[PDB]
């Protein structure tokens, strides 16, 4: 159940952006899910705060939750679309893809 | 219930590091907790991926979870302690304090 990156595919169709975007159809967005608890393995990228907090937790659940499995690195994407005026454009949306997850 | 930073204080005593550390006793570590769902207000710092994912979710819960409320910025700390040999030292532990949370 450990914290890891999972697959997720966005079809512009789904989001309704079906219309303006020439390309692509959709993309690989991915998503972070899993648990952050000991063993906090290294390829599970935990910060220091994550350990303390994972630990305090263990001493005192009521006190504090485990850290959440969130994305540690994001990659931008580029879609080509028809703005108004009917100019064909290229936009770079940043922070759209998840590259890596971890306990933070 | 919205995603925000909360107070948390670590007493070196609790962690057992009671002994080697001259100073401080403990510190303000803070922790991120709360929900990531619309309204994804701005002072709730959400990435793009966070919106898509918050949205896909809403279309298809089964499909994907809301983003998790994780710390967006960390601050290091310095503790003064007795290493072996009985040298009094100053260490900077990085990423110990949470400065800010948000939906990522």
From Swiss-Prot, chains A, B:
Keyword Glycoprotein: yes
Organism: Homo sapiens (Human)
Assembly description: Homodimer; disulfide-linked. Interacts with SOSTDC1. Interacts with TWSG1. Interacts with FBN1 (via N-terminal domain) and FBN2. Interacts with type I receptor ACVR1. Interacts with type II receptor ACVR2A. Interacts with NOG; this interaction inhibits canonical BMP signaling. Interacts with SCUBE3. Interacts with ERFE; the interaction inhibits BMP-induced transcription of HAMP. Interacts with TGFBR3.
Protein name per its UniProtKB record: Bone morphogenetic protein 7
Main location: secreted
Tissue: Expressed in the kidney and bladder. Lower levels seen in the brain.
Localization: Secreted
PTM description: Several N-termini starting at positions 293, 300, 315 and 316 have been identified by direct sequencing resulting in secretion of different mature forms.
Encoding gene per record: BMP7
Family that this chain belongs to: Belongs to the TGF-beta family.
Assigned GO CC terms: extracellular region; extracellular space; vesicle
């Amino acid at each position: 159940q450990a914290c890891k990156k999972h697959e997720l595919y966005v079809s512009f169709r789904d989001l309704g952006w079906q219309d303006w975007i020439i390309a692509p159809e959709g993309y690989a967005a991915y998503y972070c899910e899993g648990e952050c608890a000991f063993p906090l393995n290294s390829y599970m990228n935990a910060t220091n705060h994550a350990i303390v907090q994972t630990l305090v937790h263990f001493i005192n659940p009521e006190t504090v939750p485990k850290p959440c499995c969130a994305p540690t690195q994001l990659n931008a994407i580029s879609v080509l679309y028809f703005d108004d005026s009917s100019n064909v454009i290229l936009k770079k949306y940043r922070n759209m893809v998840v590259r890596a997850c971890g306990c933070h």
